[PDB]
Amino acid sequence: APARFCVYYDGHLPATRVLLMYVRIGTTATITARGHEFEVEAKDQNCKVILTNGKQAPDWLAAEPY
């Protein structure tokens, strides 16, 4: 029973990337980026850019593990 966590970032090269915020895999919350609100869902280590508003993240949206 290791530690599982999901992270969210914004479209930006690793040269000047910028972390948005950490999302604990315990409840459903919303993220604020580019004056927009992205409501993602965390179920486990397997996290994928998706919204609960019947829509999918943009082309400049991503989500790394941990």
**Domain ranges (residues) in the chain:** 1-66
Token readout for 65 is: 């593990």
As a dihedral over the C-alpha atoms of residue 32, residue 38, residue 39, residue 43, rounded to 10 degrees, the angle is -100
C-alpha closest to that of 13 among 65, 62, 66: 62
Q: How was this structure determined?
A: NMR
Token readout for 20 is: 């948005």
Token readout for 49 is: 């850019």
Judging by beta carbons within 10 Å of its beta carbon (0-12, 13-18, 19+), is residue 40 exposed, middle or buried? buried
CA distances (Å), origin 56, targets 12, 29, 42:
19, 16, 15
CA 13 – CA 51 distance, rounded (Å): 23
Half-sphere exposure of 19 (CA within 13 A, CB side): 8
